């Protein structure tokens, strides 16, 4: 077998050969028997049961609270992932499997932040949404006991290629040549912090008005970033679904577009919204890239909804295909359907489960088999689709290690997209035999102090060879 045919040089080397191998660590074994073998062969050669030094993998659940039937009231006690913490033991080439189980709990809290394009074509929309808060709370009452709504608005960076800068009147009223009034241009502004006083949405929306800009693309991704990362400013709860509802009728600027304005500092993904609720870095820092937006949307557990008009639906579909936990819906040219658009998009955001993995060590890899509906199996897939609110799904996960890691313990997190319920895996590596606690260099027995202590058999320093270190290695001899 593989254990006996490689060199029996130490117990540590023997365990590194294959997951099947074991090592006899005391002198009762007959000389010429290979000390590294399958444990049953060490028992055939009468090795003592405590001497066989055979670690075997295990996966023990340290925290295992049951899945909740209701999202209402219980707050921090609501549980959507079945094992919360697991201890996992591995050895230098082995694999071990464990099961995670996930539920789309019903009547869970919801935070809706409404992020609105306020370019000049959006006046029909801004007139149509002026009573949206009480309509939205009336429909969402079917789906959640505990809704919060908030509001913010965007146009684009207030800088030369994008905003009107002559005549001087156009700085104060960008609509002067249209013989009407609109606001000075702004990049992003926060308006209403997430609140369950639903009438505040109706009050704050009636006080807004549009602005105007030169080119067709809008600065909306710069606003999605600040609505993501400014936690205490926006008001996102820990224990809720987060919906970021992004509305526009236009295409958008992207990272590296800011170079036409003389803006070349990369977006840092920090919060820059001040005491005046305006985004202060707007004129000095570039637009976000899709990878940086994807990172922050995942880090903050947000689900993004692109509510966009027919002339740009395919553009935002092809961006949605690059961002996890994201969807698109066809907005009316006056926002008159946005209520059903939010309610249907929340359904499309709960008809999935998909697993993120975080902090996974370079020595590990994972593979997933998904159960989904009707006790089926889909192999190799981190996802389920066609689900409903109230459904429960299972995944079987297998982890494998490549060699022995140099740190004996580490941890990593398995988590559904859009939730903070998670499974924490703690990994421990059994590359070492227990007898190594009794090791000694230049030890007694063996031969003339040339042997490191046995763990089962003497190990030589330089110049020497043999099972008691009894022969010099400088050339082969019988003595």
């Amino acid at each position: 077998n593989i254990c006996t045919t490689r060199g029996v040089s130490s117990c540590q080397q023997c365990l590194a050969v294959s997951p099947m191998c074991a090592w006899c660590s005391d002198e009762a074994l007959p000389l010429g028997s290979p000390r590294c073998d399958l444990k049953e062969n060490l028992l055939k050669d009468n090795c003592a049961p405590e001497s066989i030094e055979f670690p075997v993998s295990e996966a023990r659940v340290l925290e295992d609270r049951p899945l909740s039937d209701k999202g209402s009231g219980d707050s921090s006690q609501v549980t959507q992932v079945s094992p919360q913490r697991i201890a996992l033991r591995l050895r230098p080439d082995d694999s071990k499997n464990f099961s995670i189980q996930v539920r789309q709990v019903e009547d869970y809290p919801v935070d809706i932040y409404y992020l609105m394009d306020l370019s000049y074509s959006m006046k029909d929309d801004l007139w149509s949404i002026q009573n949206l808060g009480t309509k939205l709370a009336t429909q969402m009452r079917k789906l959640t006991s505990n809704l919060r709504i908030g509001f913010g608005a965007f146009v684009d960076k207030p800088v030369s290629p994008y905003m009107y800068i002559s005549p001087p009147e156009a700085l104060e009223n960008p609509c002067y040549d249209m013989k009407t009034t609109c606001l000075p241009m702004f990049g992003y502004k926060h308006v209403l912090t997430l609140t369950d006083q639903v009438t505040r949405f109706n009050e704050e929306v009636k006080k807004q008005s549009v602005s105007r800009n030169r080119d067709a693309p809008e600065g909306g991704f710069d606003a999605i970033m600040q609505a993501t990362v400014c936690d205490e400013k926006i008001g996102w709860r820990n224990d809720a679904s987060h919906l970021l509802v992004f509305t526009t009728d236009a295409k958008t600027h992207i990272a590296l577009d800011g170079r036409l304005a003389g803006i070349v500092q990369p977006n840092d993904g920090q919060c820059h919204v001040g005491s005046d609720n305006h985004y202060s870095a707007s004129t000095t820092m570039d637009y976000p890239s899709l990878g940086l937006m994807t990172e922050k949307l995942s880090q903050k557990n947000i689900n993004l909804i692109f509510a966009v008009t027919e002339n740009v639906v395919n553009l935002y579909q092809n961006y949605s295909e690059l961002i996890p936990g994201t969807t698109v819906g066809v907005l009316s040219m006056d926002s008159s359907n946005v209520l059903q658009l939010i309610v249907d998009a929340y359904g499309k955001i709960r008809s999935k489960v998909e697993l993120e993995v975080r902090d996974l060590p370079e020595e590990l890899s994972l593979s997933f088999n998904a159960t989904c509906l009707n006790n089926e199996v889909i192999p190799g897939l981190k996802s389920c689709m066609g689900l409903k609110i109230g459904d429960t799904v299972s995944f079987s996960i297998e982890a494998k290690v490549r060699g022995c890691p140099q740190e004996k313990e580490k941890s990593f997190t398995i988590k559904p997209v859009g939730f903070k319920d998670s499974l924490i895996v703690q990994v421990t590596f059994d590359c070492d035999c227990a007898c190594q606690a009794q090791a000694e260099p230049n030890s007694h027995r063996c031969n003339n102090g040339n042997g490191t202590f046995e763990c089962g058999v003497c190990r030589c320093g330089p110049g020497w060879l043999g099972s008691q270190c009894e022969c010099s290695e400088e050339d082969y001899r019988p003595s």
């Binding site: 080119d215 067709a216 992207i254």
Partner: protein, 592 residues
């Protein structure tokens, strides 16, 4: 493998000037001197009433390494009428683009704005200054009477620029025709001869320009980047440009015929918002007459081992062929959010092996995110896909990211050693740095033993000592070395030899050198560059049967050679290097 990393030359501008945002060499025909040109687009200037006008500095290579501004324009804004300015030079970004060719320097201000002849607008047409020698002129092809966003008013002309082999400028303006963007090209003699300081909208007769197209092409940014090279075989350079928002935001590159501005070829990206066309370059990488196209996509996301998309960036390499096809290969970045492909610079032939080489930047990669430049070599098959050197930024943020590698220039030999150098800009720290290419030595080494087999039988060594004859073997070694360009005619190698080299635990050696009575030899050897193999020979011997038992394993002879680099250094302190595929040691064996 060839740039000197331990002793590069630094240059610095004013704090917050963006010194290093654009770099080029200046190599005038009139004298033996050469200079670096560095753009500083946020620098303050002595121009009356102007704030952050920007400037270009001419930086000396040796000895004092002084930088001084070039006086392209000392004036404030011109007036159209009393209290009615013609133009707005504050914050214009002058020196955001810089190029030179012989005595000609072209530098541009993409954010220059003007008040049209017709109405009190403020429109970012952009402007350039061309210096031809003692004479400076203004070139502003977008300052035309086509005055709105639907025309050339928002053009930003000079956002990118290049020179062809024949004297034409190529100029990009990404904002023309509702940000469709535009290319313009003019003859340099036509630019200089039609200049008149009294006329604001000059018309040039030999001008080539791209036209306005259908509204489906708006917001495409044609002219965001440019490069030049021949792509249809008549010897005139064609115009290559990045169009990073084209095709529903996949991005494109367009090639236009250099004599008539008709379209030759299109390349298209494969992922949205990857910014395919942020940087372009054209150079022959595989050793043909045909130039090859390099396209950067700094924001490209590939899939990791877990299947997650990660923002590494990409370069696309397109080898031209005589059939009019291209053979296309892709090259992904090494680190997430590093923006690999942000700048691309043809180096010329960096190690003189016969194929041109290229530098590709990742200005937000490396430890502390200080920025990295990767060097790649040309081969008869294409670009070698593995980088043969890594250059790393050496300054902390202070407080914007240093952006080392965001601008680069290669393909000029500034100290005349025969190998082309590299300038890297690090504008976030207001700094530029020069890396010099080292002379490359190719070494051929020989090692031989005359009797390949022996049986302690040919007992003939008389030995300087005891009278009994010993079993000899003759062993000999040789070197030759040479390299292109400038390096010393004599090279000193330390040559070092071992006998029984595989068994060296302090165990008994069975083979020894005859005169030394030891298993080792070392020799300071001086060789002259050229084809003549230089050699030395020694006698060695095998010990008596009383002295060792192992008759089974081969006797191994091992040689190493090391160049005395500190002795081979030139007058500037630049040391040569051994060609990267040179094995530093060689072996032979014999049997008993």
């Amino acid at each position: 493998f060839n740039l000197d990393v331990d002793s590069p030359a630094e240059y610095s501008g004013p704090e917050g000037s963006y010194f290093g945002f654009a770099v080029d060499f200046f190599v005038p025909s009139a004298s033996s001197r050469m200079f670096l040109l560095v753009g500083a687009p946020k620098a303050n200037t002595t121009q009356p009433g102007i704030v952050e006008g920007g400037q270009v500095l001419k930086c000396d290579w040796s000895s004092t390494r002084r930088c001084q501004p070039i006086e392209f324009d000392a004036t404030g804004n011109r007036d159209y009428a009393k209290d009615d300015p013609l133009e707005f030079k504050s914050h214009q970004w002058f020196g955001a683009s810089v190029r030179s060719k012989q005595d000609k320097i072209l530098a541009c201000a993409p954010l220059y704005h003007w008040r049209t002849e017709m109405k009190q607008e403020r429109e970012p047409v952009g402007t350039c200054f061309l210096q031809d020698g003692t004479k400076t002129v203004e070139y502003a092809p977008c300052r035309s009477q086509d005055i709105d966003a639907d025309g050339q008013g928002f053009c930003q002309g000079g956002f990118s620029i290049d020179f062809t082999k024949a004297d034409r400028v190529l100029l990009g303006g990404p904002g023309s025709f509702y940000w469709q963007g535009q290319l313009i090209s003019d003859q340099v003699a036509e630019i200089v001869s039609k200049y008149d300081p009294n006329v604001y909208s000059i018309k040039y007769n030999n001008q080539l320009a791209t036209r306005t197209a259908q509204a489906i092409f708006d917001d495409s940014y044609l002219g965001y980047s440019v490069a030049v090279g021949d792509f249809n075989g008549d010897g005139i350079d064609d115009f290559v440009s990045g169009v990073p928002r084209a095709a529903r935001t996949l991005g494109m590159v367009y090639i236009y015929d250099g004599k008539n501005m008709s379209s030759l070829y299109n390349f298209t990206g494969e992922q949205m918002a990857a910014y395919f066309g942020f940087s372009v370059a054209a150079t022959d990488i595989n050793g043909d007459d045909y130039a090859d196209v390099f396209i950067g996509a700094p924001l490209f996301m590939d899939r990791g081992s877990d299947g997650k998309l990660q923002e590494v960036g990409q370069v696309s390499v397109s080898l031209q062929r005589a059939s009019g096809d291209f053979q296309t290969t892709k090259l992904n970045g090494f680190e997430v959010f590093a923006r690999f492909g942000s700048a691309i610079a043809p180096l010329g032939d960096l190690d003189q092996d016969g194929f041109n080489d290229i530098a590709i930047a990742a200005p937000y990669g490396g430890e502390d995110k200080k920025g990295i430049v990767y060097i790649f070599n040309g081969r008869s098959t294409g670009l070698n896909a593995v980088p043969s050197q890594i250059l790393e930024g050496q300054w902390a943020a202070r407080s914007m990211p240093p952006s080392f590698g965001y601008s680069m220039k290669g393909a000029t030999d500034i100290d005349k050693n025969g190998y082309p150098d590299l300038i890297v800009g690090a504008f976030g720290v207001d700094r530029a740095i020069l890396y010099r290419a080292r002379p490359v030595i190719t070494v051929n080494a020989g090692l031989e033993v005359y009797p390949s087999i022996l049986n302690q039988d040919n007992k003939t060594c008389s030995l300087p000592g005891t009278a009994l004859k010993v079993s000899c073997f003759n062993v000999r070694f040789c070197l030759k070395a040479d390299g292109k360009g400038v390096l010393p005619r004599k090279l000193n190698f330390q040559v070092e030899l071992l006998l029984d080299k595989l068994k060296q635990k302090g165990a008994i050696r069975r083979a020894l050198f005859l005169y030394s009575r030891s298993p080792s030899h070392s020799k300071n050897m001086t060789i002259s560059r050229g084809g003549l193999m230089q050699c030395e020979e020694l006698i060695a011997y095998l010990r008596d049967e009383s002295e060792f038992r192992d008759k089974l394993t081969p006797i191994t002879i091992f040689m190493e050679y090391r160049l005395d680099y500190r002795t081979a250094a030139d007058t500037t302190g630049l040391q040569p290097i051994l060609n990267q595929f040179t094995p530093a040691n060689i072996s032979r064996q014999a049997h008993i």
